[PDB]
Amino acid sequence: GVWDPNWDRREYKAKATRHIFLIRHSQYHVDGSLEKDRTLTPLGREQAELTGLRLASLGLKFNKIVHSSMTRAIETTDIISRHLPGVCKVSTDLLREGAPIEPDPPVSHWKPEAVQYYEDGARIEAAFRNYIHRADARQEEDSYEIFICHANVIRYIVCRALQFPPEGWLRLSLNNGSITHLVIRPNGRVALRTLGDTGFMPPDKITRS
Amino acid sequence: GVWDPNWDRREHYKAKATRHIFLIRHSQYHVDGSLEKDRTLTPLGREQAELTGLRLASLGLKFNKIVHSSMTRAIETTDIISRHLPGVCKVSTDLLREGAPIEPDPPVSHWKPEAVQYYEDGARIEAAFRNYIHRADARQEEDSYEIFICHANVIRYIVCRALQFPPEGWLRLSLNNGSITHLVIRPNGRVALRTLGDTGFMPPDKITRS
Amino acid sequence: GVWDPNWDRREHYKAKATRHIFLIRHSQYHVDGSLEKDRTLTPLGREQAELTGLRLASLGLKFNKIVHSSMTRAIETTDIISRHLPGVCKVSTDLLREGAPIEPDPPVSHWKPEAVQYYEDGARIEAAFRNYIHRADARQEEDSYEIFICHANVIRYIVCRALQFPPEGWLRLSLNNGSITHLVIRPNGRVALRTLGDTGFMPPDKITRS
Amino acid sequence: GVWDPNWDRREHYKAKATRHIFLIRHSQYHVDGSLEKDRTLTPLGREQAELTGLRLASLGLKFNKIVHSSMTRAIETTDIISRHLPGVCKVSTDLLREGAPIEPDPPVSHWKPEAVQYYEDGARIEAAFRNYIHRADARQEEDSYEIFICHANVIRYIVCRALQFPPEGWLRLSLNNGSITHLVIRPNGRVALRTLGDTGFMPPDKITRS
Amino acid sequence: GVWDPNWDRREHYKAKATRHIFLIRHSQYHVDGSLEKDRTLTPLGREQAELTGLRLASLGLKFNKIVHSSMTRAIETTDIISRHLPGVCKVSTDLLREGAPIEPDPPVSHWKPEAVQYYEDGARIEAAFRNYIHRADARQEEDSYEIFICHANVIRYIVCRALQFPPEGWLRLSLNNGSITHLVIRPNGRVALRTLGDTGFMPPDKITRS
Amino acid sequence: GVWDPNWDRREYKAKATRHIFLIRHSQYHVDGSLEKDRTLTPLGREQAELTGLRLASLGLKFNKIVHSSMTRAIETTDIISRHLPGVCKVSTDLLREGAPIEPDPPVSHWKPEAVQYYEDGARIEAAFRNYIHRADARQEEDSYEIFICHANVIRYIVCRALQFPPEGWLRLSLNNGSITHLVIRPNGRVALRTLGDTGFMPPDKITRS
Amino acid sequence: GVWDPNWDRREYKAKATRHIFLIRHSQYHVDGSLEKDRTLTPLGREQAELTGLRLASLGLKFNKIVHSSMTRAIETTDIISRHLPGVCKVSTDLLREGAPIEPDPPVSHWKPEAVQYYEDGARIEAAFRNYIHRADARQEEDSYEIFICHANVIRYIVCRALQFPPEGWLRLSLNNGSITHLVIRPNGRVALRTLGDTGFMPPDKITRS
Amino acid sequence: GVWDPNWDRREHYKAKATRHIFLIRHSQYHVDGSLEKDRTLTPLGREQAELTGLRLASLGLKFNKIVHSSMTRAIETTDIISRHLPGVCKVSTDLLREGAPIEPDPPVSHWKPEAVQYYEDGARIEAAFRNYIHRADARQEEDSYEIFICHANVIRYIVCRALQFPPEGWLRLSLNNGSITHLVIRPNGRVALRTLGDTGFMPPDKITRS
Amino acid sequence: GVWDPNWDRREHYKAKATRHIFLIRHSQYHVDGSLEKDRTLTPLGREQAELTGLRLASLGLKFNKIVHSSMTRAIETTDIISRHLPGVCKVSTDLLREGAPIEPDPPVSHWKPEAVQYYEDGARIEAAFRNYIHRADARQEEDSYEIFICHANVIRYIVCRALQFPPEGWLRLSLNNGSITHLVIRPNGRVALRTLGDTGFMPPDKITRS
């Protein structure tokens, strides 16, 4: 039940804090037939633009923008990339949407089958481990890193990062284009500083699908 | 100890199709290369991929896709093998990049990565295994022939996991550069390894492991 | 689960030599043949052994011996492979005749021999494994290259036992006719499988498994 | 402790035939002989095999086959015993060569081979036991009388295994040179030892154990 | 499972002497005989004891004593064997009379005595075993050669107990009429069976088991 | 702890009672060098004569006289046999003297070694089983049987017959020439009716060695 | 299960052995209406006379004759007292006949009820303790003591003295007028030297009721 | 803790009769007396027994028996009490002689007998309790009035046992010389103590406890 | 089971004095009397108290106090007993009134008060016990002789508690009318009952229990 301080790589000793900005994609055409048809809507593009504008206004030197290989995630990265010029980009399969694990409590509308929790769960857990950890000892400066992916992924990441039961990932909810801020101090401590932040979007332009 | 027949998704309709999977190690490459993009194939490397490509074309098979690691050596061998198999879908993947799958038994002196690597990479390679090695989808009508161009530790760990052998013994296998490794996955969920580290098609003077 | 390093004879002095072992399945043969002596190679069979022989000659290796099964199909492939490797000691063996090593897991419908076969043949194939697969004698100065021309179940059981994988999974492997399978046994007792069921040297139209 | 009645192949129909098995130790031989081919019978040795042969001929039995070890001393006694039993099939075997079957209990000072021998030879002698000692095939109509000309440790281990006594006690038995040992295997699977180390037919001045 | 070295009286001074024990089954006898004294040897019986006697005399051994069962068939064979070994102490015993030592495994249909017999006779035969089969007394200077003329079940149970094999398997052995069985008991407590059911000295036409 | 009614062969069903008369030998020359030197003394012969005379005076038709093969036991059987003419005799090794089992409580003067308890114990126990049991079902008449042997043997027989701890065999004591009477009813029940009886010997002629 | 060496009063230290002679009464009129009618028969008196004669012939200086207060026990003491003149006599209630404890194995003819085992058992056990023990430390000479009582009493005494299961008291049997000899060495060790001895009675004059 | 109603013989017919039991301690006596027969009553003693006797006669009861201890002081008081109750059966007993019933709690300094006494005497006094204190026999028609003339420890132990109080507390009671103690035993098995250590009938100048 | 030596106040200095306590039941009284004041002594009652009084005067003891129950029958007997003991302090008490102390074991049919009485009266009688029955105060130099004139259940419960017997057995005792009961309490805390229900001083025709 207690916090594990070696949830990755515990004590050179690390000096740097990593700020992690987990961003859900914007609105997209769900009905789209093939993956490449599932592109952002006109509203979607407006949302990513605001999200991009907000990150630019923070006055931070972002190191990289890592993103899911799904078309909706790429298209929001395309728009957010404009407001943050000359920032390294990296495509990832690990951050594609999936079914992380059986959510508790259960739900009627959404019950994927055991094979999905098996295949996707190992992938999302692998994403968590590779992207959420304390700094390398060889990192001199504090990093600010953007991760543009999907709802289940982010919510599972957040629960795992905080060492809450991962089963409760579906007790969280994230709007489209929403910024979620995790801090990872070099002693291994994690703090969630905002979740599902879309205070920067005019209320008429906030959605979850 | 016993074979698990629901190692993924056992009998919704039932699968009809067999998947042939061709796990191909990359060719020789400049290890000393400074950045990842400098770690390109050698002149010998290119010769090896050419032979591997030539061999796959000679099989008389209609390959559906070529999936490959995002590492530069894997891409460059895919570039050459792609020429002999024209008009075949290609897909880049991070999952299949080289890593340290898990603690190998018995241990070795030259190569001992630290626990964090087995943690981070192991979950990634295991995720790769699960997403690419399984029996057919029920909605697949025809038998597939699929190429996977990646790296040694990855392939050897895939093979051990596919066969349900202890994954710890992945380093008891060894694979030459440009080598074809054939797994069959019948729709009943059964796996058979049909050849491993095959480079019989390379002239002996052109066979390497680094 | 763990690797046993004294699976035979662990550190008279200490061994210096690596043994390369080349387990070769026989070529195509007339299965319908009435008596054992009728079960001879086919025209295709002879073509396969010729290629296998040609490939071994092209390796530029000084083979020490060719040990073979006493079954007619194994002898006949040894006859052809022996031509390309002139002046190499040959030795006939009963231990390496085909059999049913042990109950395979998972089971199969087409092939179910009865308990007495697993008992009689299993002890024979296990005896073959122990007598031929081990690390070098201490009195051997130079690295050996040894050919073993026998049969599918035998080889697959040898391979599983050599690698210390569950022997029950011998039928999860599959070996083509005339196929070269390479095991290395370093003098520290470590075993590595370097290729399995290699027939990259055969034109695709001439590859079979029966 | 209890007798296993399916120690091989228990109730294609059911067996009708009893197999009489005559395990014969070789005669005296030159132990000091440098190579295996030098280890030939002595003048006394030949006298012993002659008596053993004479005795088997006097039994009035139609022997089906004489199976023998491939060691020179075993062959040479088979050569002499073969004369008195004319027109009886002969078969050479590696399985029946002398070895160290398993760690004997209690231990002995004079004779302590090392673990690798018990491993390699034990599997071979056990394989010999299983392949030659079992109840009749169902397709055998008449009772067989079979001769097996081999070596002391082999026979004593066979006998202990046949009777289902602890095989560790093989060295608690002792067999003279040229000695006949009679096992019966009724078709119900029951084994009876009817004489062991019989050399009552040799004049006392011509009995040896080395 | 392991050999007990203090199965009697292990290292008072220490034993120096080996005891050779010659367990001899009686010859053929009239089973149908009404009273015990009617159960005398047949004409063949007498011929058998004569040969057995002749054989023991030909060994060139100075026998110390002849101990025998008090049953008439055992006495009558002792009478004939005593002639060829003149001036050798004789001693009658009840302990060595025939009985049912213990439940034999596996069971038999023809012969099933009831629990009271295994109780009464078993304690008697076990007492016989202990009193006659042990290592030498320390006060015995010379190696002994001792004859024990008794019955089949007795001998077979003695042999199993002497060798520390499961006594239940006494009926897995079988002994001819007039047959010599040789046990050696070295002064360190070690037992070796050197021949069992030896009747090689009888012409085949004169060998029986009842 | 409770009486076992199948201490041999329990329920044709038996009809006959067996009376068993366990008789210790008379005085003998203990110092005698070889077994054949250990013969009865002049007093010994007097004792056996009285014992014999007493058994003849009982007016019983004795079926057999079984005896130990030791010289002192034979010699007393020779004298007792005279007073009971035409009664079957049988020699036995089972009834020779020995050390039946470790006696409790222990004693200082007499401590034989483990090998004796092993070899002799199995023999005396075998004697007990073969001679002490209920009648055969095929026995029509009540038997009266004499057993001429030795002290340790008899005392061990008695303890075993009564189902008392056999360890207490040395808590009993038996005079030379002494009659000991066991009854074995056909239902398997045993009764000791006299032990170490030498009331028939003049007091000046009673010994235990 | 093992012998208890402090079955009474274990280690001045005792020097003396006590010989104890437990004697059953002679034949008596069982049918007698009142206790005083249950007197010895003409045969009874003959038996006590022989028993008395035998004890006198032992050449022992008896210290006391203790006896049961039942009329048959007194009457045999009267006759035995004649042959041992000037020997202290003592009457006792403790040694009257009773049912000591449930006998094993059971019997059909004789099954007294629980109250008897309760009342009599405590009395016979009290008799055992008061009369059967090792010598007092203050006793210089070896004693020879006579106890004239009844069958169940004696048989229970004997079983308890020897430390055998007392339940087996009915596995013993004692003739009328029979001498039973217990020895109690000063180290606390007990030996039974004869039981139910009537070798001194002509066979035609031996009874058990 | 609870009253046991079958402390002897509970409901064969059922008891109808109540037993009154009058436990009387002896009078004063010469303790210093050398032998038991010297320990006779004093002149005061005789006066006490006379009063006790006089009191029992004045009760107007038909006493059935007077049972008494065999000690001389108990007999001598019975002699005097017997005069006032003419023609009443008398019976001597060893059971009721004085002793040490069991370890008294709490302990005392002046009087500590040793374990052997509690063993020997305790079983005797307990036997006395059981034989004399119980409910009526069914065959007793009339209510009995019974006198028991004995000693202090005996009576006090009887009383504690009769009432089912801890017998260890027997020394918490105290009884004067010549004192009457009355127990009633109704035929349902119930016990009542009606007076204890009653000497109200003695002039105070004539009351003692030794 | 064991005696508690600190049943009150165990070793201000240490106690020197013994307390004699004389628990006296009231005399006969009119039970049928309507109100408590009607329940006065009978003519016989007065005769009884007179004798009890006369007896206490004859003891030659200097009584310190007479404590009594406030019930009319207890007062009236105190009135008569007070005459024979002139100038002795008197004290009335509610604690010593009659009640139901606790459930008696064994139970009775005639008398079954209900749980509330055992609750209310039990606490009162127990309080009486504690306040009046204990060892002397340390400040008391001389031995006391104290009279307590009360009722049957009270006294019997006091006695059981004083002796540390199960209080449940209070009804196993019985006390006559006018009866003296003597408890001694030595300064070490030890209690002895020296007589109970003593009415030896009353002519038999004048003894009652109601």
Residue numbers in the entry:
A (entry chain C), F (entry chain C), G (entry chain C): 56 to 66, 92 to 289
B (entry chain B), C (entry chain A), D (entry chain A), E (entry chain B), H (entry chain B), I (entry chain A): 56 to 66, 91 to 289
Excerpt from the paper describing this PDB structure:
PGAM5 is a mitochondrial membrane protein that functions as an atypical Ser/Thr phosphatase and is a regulator of oxidative stress response, necroptosis, and autophagy. Phosphoglycerate mutase family member 5 (PGAM5) is a mitochondrial membrane protein that belongs to the phosphoglycerate mutase (PGAM) branch of the histidine acid phosphatase superfamily, known also as two-histidine phosphatase (2H-phosphatase). Overall, the catalytic domain of PGAM5 adopted a classical phosphoglycerate mutase-like fold with the canonical three-layer sandwich topology, which featured a six-stranded β sheet flanked on both sides by α helices with the first four parallel strands arranged in an alternated β/α manner.
To provide structural insights into the role of the N terminus, we next determined the structure of the longer ΔN54-PGAM5 in complex with a phosphate ion. In all three molecules in the asymmetric unit, although most parts of the N-terminal extension to the catalytic domain (amino acids 67–90) was disordered, clear electron density allowed a confident assignment of the WDPNWD motif within the N-terminal region, which packed along the surface of the catalytic core. The accommodation of the WDPNWD motif required both intra- and interdimeric contacts where the tryptophan residues of this motif were accommodated in two hydrophobic grooves, located at intermolecular interfaces created by two different PGAM5 subunits. The presence of the WDPNWD motif triggered a simultaneous occurrence of two interesting structural features that were not observed in the short ΔN90-PGAM5 structures, including the now ordered proline-rich β3-α3 loop and the newly formed interdimeric interactions resulting in a dodecameric assembly. Within the asymmetric unit, one subunit of the dimer associated with the subunit of an adjacent dimer with their α3 helices paired in a reverse manner at the dimer-dimer interface. The WDPNWD-containing N terminus was then positioned in proximity to the proline-rich β3-α3 catalytic loop, leading to an alternated arrangement that resulted in the β3-α3 catalytic loop of one molecule being sandwiched between two neighboring N termini, one from the subunit within the dimer and the other from the protomer of the adjacent dimer. This configuration promoted most likely an ordering of the loop that in turn completed the active site architecture, a feature not observed in the ΔN90-PGAM5 structure.
